[PDB]
Design a protein around this nucleic acid. Structure first.
Ligand SMILES: NCCC[C@H](N)CC(=O)NCCC[C@H](N)CC(=O)NCCC[C@H](N)CC(=O)N[C@@H]1[C@H](O)[C@@H](OC(N)=O)[C@@H](CO)O[C@H]1NC1=N[C@@H]2C(=O)NC[C@@H](O)[C@H]2N1
Ligand SMILES: NCCC[C@H](N)CC(=O)NCCC[C@H](N)CC(=O)NCCC[C@H](N)CC(=O)N[C@@H]1[C@H](O)[C@@H](OC(N)=O)[C@@H](CO)O[C@H]1NC1=N[C@@H]2C(=O)NC[C@@H](O)[C@H]2N1
Lengths: 77, 91, 103, 44, 60
RNA sequence: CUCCGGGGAGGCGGCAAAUAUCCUUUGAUCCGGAGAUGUCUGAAUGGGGGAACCCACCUACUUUAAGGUAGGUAUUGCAACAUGAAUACAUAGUGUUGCAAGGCGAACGAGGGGAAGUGAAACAUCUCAGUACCCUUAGGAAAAGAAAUCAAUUGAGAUUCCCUCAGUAGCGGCGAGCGAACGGGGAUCAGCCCAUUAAGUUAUGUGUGUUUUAGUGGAACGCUCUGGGAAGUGCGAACGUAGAGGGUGAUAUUCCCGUACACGAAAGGGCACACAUAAUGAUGACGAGUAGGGCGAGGCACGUGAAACCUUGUCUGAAUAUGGGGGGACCAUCCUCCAAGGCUAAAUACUCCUGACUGACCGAUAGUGAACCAGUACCGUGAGGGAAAGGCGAAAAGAACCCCU
RNA sequence: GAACCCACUGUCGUUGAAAAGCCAGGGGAUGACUUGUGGAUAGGGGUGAAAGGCUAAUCAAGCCUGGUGAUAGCUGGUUCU
RNA sequence: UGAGAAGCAUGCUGGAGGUAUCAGAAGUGCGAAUGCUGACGUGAGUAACGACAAAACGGGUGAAAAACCCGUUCGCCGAAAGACCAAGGGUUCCAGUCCAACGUUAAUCGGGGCUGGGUGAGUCGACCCCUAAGGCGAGGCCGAAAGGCGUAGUCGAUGGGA
């Protein structure tokens, strides 16, 4: 399903609101996509399904820290 | 085979005109047997408990009747019969 | 306040009130007393066993509360209590406290 | 004339049978409702 | 009869079980043929078998 | 079926009589506690399958014939061990052992989605309503909880529930409608910690207390009349820490079962307290992709409104105690608190169940659909729908025998 | 032109023998044929050599259970002196 | 007896409950709603008794015979109105016994009631080995959840195998 591995983001529900104030159900979806990251400590590429905010967090903290954190939550990377 | 099953296989004789004629003329004994008894089981049981020689065993199953006794409907159990042919002159 | 199979009782209620006899059986809350409360059964003949029928007289049970044990010394109705004499429980007459006489 | 009910035991069991009901969650809910109502017979 | 069975050992109990089962078969056959007037012996044997099995599992 | 305890004259369950065999004072039936056995289907788990069936494999013992007995053989997750590619180290993958989970079931809890009929005397904003329904998942309760909270004499002091404030202040095609807070009075009261780690909670073992699962004793009425039958009439007695109730041939404190009261446990279970040993609390050490901001939505009584505050799908993005949040646009001054880490009982919600007690609740077209062999008969492919039907007599004493047929 | 598959005309039947038939005639009958068994497509959906036809004797939106005791400025009824 | 809703007394039936006065509470009063449930009328002893292939007589049993049994005649079908298999049904099969209800009439008869019998396989069929359409599906891909699809496999005859 559409879940970001780094942040846990998922689609949420909301409304389309028209000019006459008609309200209809809608969904907001994350900016999800697949990306390969080079893990040097393991000499391999890891493929993650994540968002652009996930990429920003990886840029901030390093891929090793993020991968260790995700493993600590029971994610089989 | 164990003696427990050996003593449990055979239930009793059959008393009817057909059974009597078969016993009188053909050297055939008709038994009521356990519903799950096999032909080999019946052969071994008869041979052990009567000291005769069995040529062959024929088995048939008759489904129980459903009758309205009083105000309630009841059903009888299925009965398996065994035709046991003895060798030459026995029993 | 038990009534047992061999006691001597006197009827205190019903059409047999005032008569006495030996109890023949106690079952549930009903008691049969020999010679008392007789009914006439019109027995049909039995085809299988022969034994042609007829009008027979037999005892019918009364309610257990309709009889009382008879005190042999006083010839009066009485109630029953229990006393632990020695180590055994024993029935006694409430009027005089004597042990119930085995018949 | 040909009427609507044309019996067939195999089709009856494969469509409405115990294992067919057990195969889906809606069928298991059907069995739960019939058990709660106390039906003497659960399935065909 | 329970005490009498109880003093016996395992081997004697296992033998008595076979004798009682054979006797049960004989009694059933006699009742089926109709040459058995007294009928309580089938119940006695049926209870004796159960008592023997109970004592066997108790001792083992 | 076995053992232990209770009980003491009968019993072999009911419709459902009757008969035969019988059992039992050498202790039966029956009652309570603890064990033994416990076929097949069903999460069903050795494979399969149209539920109650079909077909198997491995190991050990046993038989002599085409078998028997005992055990093992599902999947997934975790851990240990062994093995092991592309590819050199490795990794993926594979196997064995051990541990755990799955399913069912009332209501209450928490979370993920979420209508329309209707009202507005039409209808789209709005209402109905976060209701009905679907989905996931706990516990005996759950959730919340120890201020980056309110207040506005500079005061209060965690959370939850009830009464009031008040149909007030406000929101609203300013329509129909929706509808607070502050303060006050009550219920219950409790705080403790972030790496040598707290309160608390859960298991196990021992001790004490209490309760529960059979049971025992248990007072005292006669005569007379009516009557098929007395408990009713008339007369006179007795008990009462017992005049609750039920039965007995009509209406009984004293006929029976009981009731007040006084005793009672081989053995097992529940709860409370204390101690002892584990674990857990506890991968967490003062909180950065965080607070705040632009765009789009949601929640707040509050529908974009002068709209503060909370949540975030998207794009961004600090200061870090000489610092930061709030006080309903916003600024200054004052007051107040310390977010981006946690645990925590009670007052609160409910009834598939167990025991006792109660009703100006019904009495067979009523009361459950069902007082009775009812979720049955019957109807439908199926989901599903769904009845009718109580009363001889105190006691069967349920009509021997004769007559017509 | 028989079996088989259809259904053009007429009488009868219409509380029927039958909730669509009988009888006398009629069309196709080696093909775009008829038929058994077992499967697939599910409700604003399916399927349709197309009639809004068919989807269990029900179809301009199947059936069942829930919202639900929908709403009805309409019709009926509303019990002794 | 009273102005009324109603009250009072008593004969018969019935066989165990009823209840003044004054207060108190309501499932408190029925002719209608094409109202609901049960019972019973009118039509009326009226229509009808289900293919127009068709019956007649002698004897038997029996309470009773147009319908049952035996016999002698007559007639109808004969590409089905005969003989089988699958599906479906489930004891309807056979014998004895009974006639209330069921049978569109009666019934001694019956697919009706009651009691007892009856289905015998190495070669027939199923089971079994094999696969089609299609179903399920270890891992896997996808999806708010439920779930959708699908690989290796595993089922599935209407077909192949003594
Ligand atoms: C990637 C991705 O997107 N992840 C999103 C996660 C969504 C989900 N919440 C995950 C979760 O946490 N729990 C549920 C996990 C299910 C998930 N949806 C994926 C999955 O396994 N589906 C299968 C699938 O439906 C079907 O299999 C086939 N072959 O069709 C069948 C199994 O045969 O049932 C499900 N499996 C089941 N296992 C379960 C069991 O044993 N008991 C209970 C019930 O859960 C059973 N169902
Ligand atoms: N001058 C003229 C003379 C003429 C001459 N004579 C010739 C003549 O012409 N004669 C005519 C004959 C008349 C008639 N034909 C005879 C007849 O009919 N016999 C019927 C015989 C069989 C009868 N069916 C049996 C029957 O029904 N049992 C009932 C039944 O099981 C059940 O009842 C319900 N609810 O279903 C039960 C309720 O609990 O009660 C049972 N029974 C009970 N009794 C018991 C009791 O009292 N206490 C204890 C308990 O045992 C009680 N249960």
């Amino acid at each position: 399903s559409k879940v970001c591995q780094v942040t846990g983001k998922r689609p949420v529900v909301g409304n389309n609101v028209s000019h006459a104030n008609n309200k209809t159900k809608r969904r907001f979806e994350p900016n999800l996509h697949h990306h390969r990251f080079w893990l040097e400590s393991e000499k391999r590429f890891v493929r993650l399904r994540l968002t652009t905010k996930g990429m920003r967090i990886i840029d901030k903290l390093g891929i090793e820290k993020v991968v260790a954190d995700l493993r600590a939550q029971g994610q089989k990377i | 085979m164990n003696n427990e099953r050996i003593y449990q296989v055979l239930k009793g004789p059959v008393f009817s005109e057909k059974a009597q004629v078969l016993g009188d003329t053909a050297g055939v004994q008709v038994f009521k047997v356990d519903i799950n008894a096999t032909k080999l089981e019946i052969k071994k049981a008869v041979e052990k408990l009567f000291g005769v020689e069995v040529v062959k065993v024929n088995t048939t199953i008759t489904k129980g009747k459903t009758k309205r006794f009083g105000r309630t409907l009841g059903r009888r159990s299925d009965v398996k019969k065994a035709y046991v042919t003895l060798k030459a002159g026995q029993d | 306040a038990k009534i047992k199979k061999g006691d001597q009782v006197i009827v205190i209620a019903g059409k047999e009130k005032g008569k006495q006899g030996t109890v023949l059986s106690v079952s549930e809350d009903r008691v049969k007393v020999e010679g008392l409360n007789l009914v006439k059964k019109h027995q049909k003949p039995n085809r299988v066993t022969g034994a042609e029928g007829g009008i027979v007289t037999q005892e019918a049970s009364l309610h257990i509360s309709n009889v009382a044990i008879l005190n042999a010394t006083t010839q009066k109705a009485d109630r029953v209590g229990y006393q632990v004499i020695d180590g055994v429980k024993t029935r006694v007459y409430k009027s005089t406290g004597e042990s119930v006489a085995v018949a | 004339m040909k009427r609507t009910f044309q019996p067939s035991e195999l089709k009856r069991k494969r469509v409405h049978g115990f294992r067919a009901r057990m195969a889906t969650k809606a069928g298991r809910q059907v069995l739960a409702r019939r058990r709660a109502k106390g039906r003497h017979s659960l399935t065909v | 009869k329970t005490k009498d069975l109880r003093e016996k050992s395992v081997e004697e109990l296992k033998a008595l079980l076979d004798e009682q089962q054979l006797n049960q078969f004989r009694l059933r056959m006699a009742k089926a043929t109709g040459q058995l007037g007294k009928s309580h012996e089938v119940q006695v044997a049926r209870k004796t078998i159960a008592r023997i099995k109970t004592l066997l599992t108790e001792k083992q």
